[PDB]
Amino acid sequence: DTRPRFLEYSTSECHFFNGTERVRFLDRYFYNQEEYVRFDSDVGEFRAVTELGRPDEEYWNSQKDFLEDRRAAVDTYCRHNYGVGESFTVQRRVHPKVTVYPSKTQPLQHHNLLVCSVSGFYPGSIEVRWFRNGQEEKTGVVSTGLIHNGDWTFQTLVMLETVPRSGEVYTCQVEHPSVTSPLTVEWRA
Amino acid sequence: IKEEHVIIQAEFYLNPDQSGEFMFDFDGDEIFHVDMAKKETVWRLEEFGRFASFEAQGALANIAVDKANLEIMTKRSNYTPITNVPPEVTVLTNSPVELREPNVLICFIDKFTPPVVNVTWLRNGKPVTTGVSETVFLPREDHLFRKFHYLPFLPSTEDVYDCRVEHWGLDEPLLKHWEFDT
């Protein structure tokens, strides 16, 4: 479709610090690719981001009931909504699946790779550590980082550069809020 | 000092399509959206709807204001249309793939605008729709969108897969391939 498009987009954002001790509320407006005006609860009034938003800064700051609604949002909206879904969002805990498999370097390098795949977990914060004969490996540890699956789950692949010897025991160890004890998967050459 | 969590109410209205969306996002995940055609709240995971509620009428009333605001902003901009930004497309699996153990292909579409796409899943060059699912248009810290499409499948050495993405910023539909390794 070659037809020109026109987009109006808004985000009302609630940023939470130390539970709900401090809340920062942002009411943002975008026309096409441009953020033109916003209300920041720290500021206390609307402010134009660009020239395009100057008429709204002037007009919305003069709308008494609207500005007070925005000023009350941290409690009536942010803190309210935080509490509504708290049990299944903030307190959501989904335990990981830990899979260990060797992988060949392409083309062959001096080392091969040992993959620790940690999947299907929630929240995103995780600790994945490689061990060789009960000693942590800091060198040769490569990760593509935290991958969001878009379905309230995350995954991560943590690789260890290895020179695999006859009787070496490799251990991937996972710590995550969903589990009280470190999870381990052993691999032998 | 860093924030622990973010809750976003994201909404848009788009002309000439006359399409709009209203959704809530928690740390990058869709909690729910409003089905505009059915005038109903659609929960991302069924358990959410057992624990919380949302009146769709409020989203519908906001969408009508978003539409009025689009008309005002379109005139104020001197009728400037959007410049299309094509998406980055990544295809991954939910977990490492094992032969004949069901798995899920994930097509992640990111950093694009306007929020309009046509997404097709291709198995050996053929369209497949069995058990497919998707998110609505998800917010980013910028003016850009993200979206996920899902295809559950039984892994085999024979079958190949493609996620075909159409966007107005793309000269030709973008195909991202996946096939079983070794």
Partner: peptide
């Protein structure tokens, strides 16, 4: 419990 909508307001015409 109900999620609350933050109500939209018409822009300056």
């Amino acid at each position: 419990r109900f999620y609350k909508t933050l109500r939209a307001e018409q822009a300056s015409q």
